[PDB]
Design a protein around this ligand. Structure first.
Ligand SMILES: N=C(N)Nc1ccc(C(=O)O)cc1
Length: 246
């Protein structure tokens, strides 16, 4: 997250921290995700597509720090890693950039909700906020495009939903943006998602409910003029979500 503010997991208690085991045993952060039910985290296929072996990955819930334990955190193995069969990546764009991780602990339990661990609601079908709505993004991604390190402390910011018409303008992203994606940016381009925020939630208020509207997917640089963040439009994937979590 470029700009915005530091936060703790109690403010975004559906945030999932996804890590990968290396041969040798070093463990590095991969991507964010969102807990949509006690046994299911939703994320981005592009996070896993190079290393699609579920045994390689660890999921934490109730975690506020990247490389240290948060009191109350729960650690899960991935029982299933479901990537979207129609995934494709262009030089920029990721199409159908959505993934489902079925989580289960060493004792074969799912998440127990708490102050630091809660599910986020899915939107109703094709039901997105109006363009110019303010939504929240959460992640451990870079604080600056030129940073080598990720922040140790979770961050969140606010960006405004951009209309498809605006986002498909040539000097923005042209046809690289589709109706299955949402664009969001700061009017001053001063805050954005960045590398390492992939898979993380875009949350908006819909009929008085915090709702998972989007999943961090792609973008040209971060917090660049005319280069919005691009998000998987979750309200266009409910059949795929429903089918693979039955
Ligand atoms: N918000 C942007 N302008 N860019 C941007 C978005 C996502 C990612 C990612 O790694 O998923 C990287 C860069």
């Amino acid at each position: 997250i470029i700009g915005g503010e530091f936060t703790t997991i109690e403010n975004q208690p559906w945030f999932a921290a996804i890590y990968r085991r290396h041969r040798g045993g070093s463990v590095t952060y991969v991507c964010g995700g969102s807990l949509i039910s006690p046994c299911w985290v939703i994320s981005a296929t592009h996070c896993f597509i190079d290393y699609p072996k579920k045994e390689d990955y660890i999921v934490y819930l109730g975690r506020s720090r990247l490389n240290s334990n948060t009191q109350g955190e729960m650690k899960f193995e991935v029982e299933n890693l479901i990537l979207h069969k129609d995934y494709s990546a262009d030089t920029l764009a990721h199409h159908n950039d959505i993934a489902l991780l079925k989580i289960r602990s060493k004792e074969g339990r799912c998440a127990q909700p708490s102050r630091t661990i809660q599910t986020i609601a899915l939107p109703s079908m094709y039901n997105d906020p109006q363009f110019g709505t303010s939504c929240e993004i959460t992640g451990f991604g870079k604080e600056q495009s030129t940073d080598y390190l990720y922040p140790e402390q979770l961050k969140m910011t606010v960006v405004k939903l951009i209309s498809h018409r605006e986002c498909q303008q040539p000097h923005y992203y042209g046809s690289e943006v589709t109706t299955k994606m949402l664009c969001a940016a700061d009017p001053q381009w001063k805050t954005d998602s960045c590398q390492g925020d992939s898979g993380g939630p875009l949350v908006c208020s819909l009929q008085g409910r915090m709702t998972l509207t989007g999943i961090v997917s792609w973008g040209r640089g971060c917090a660049l003029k005319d280069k919005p963040g691009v998000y998987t439009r979750v309200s266009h994937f409910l059949p795929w979500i429903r089918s693979h979590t039955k």
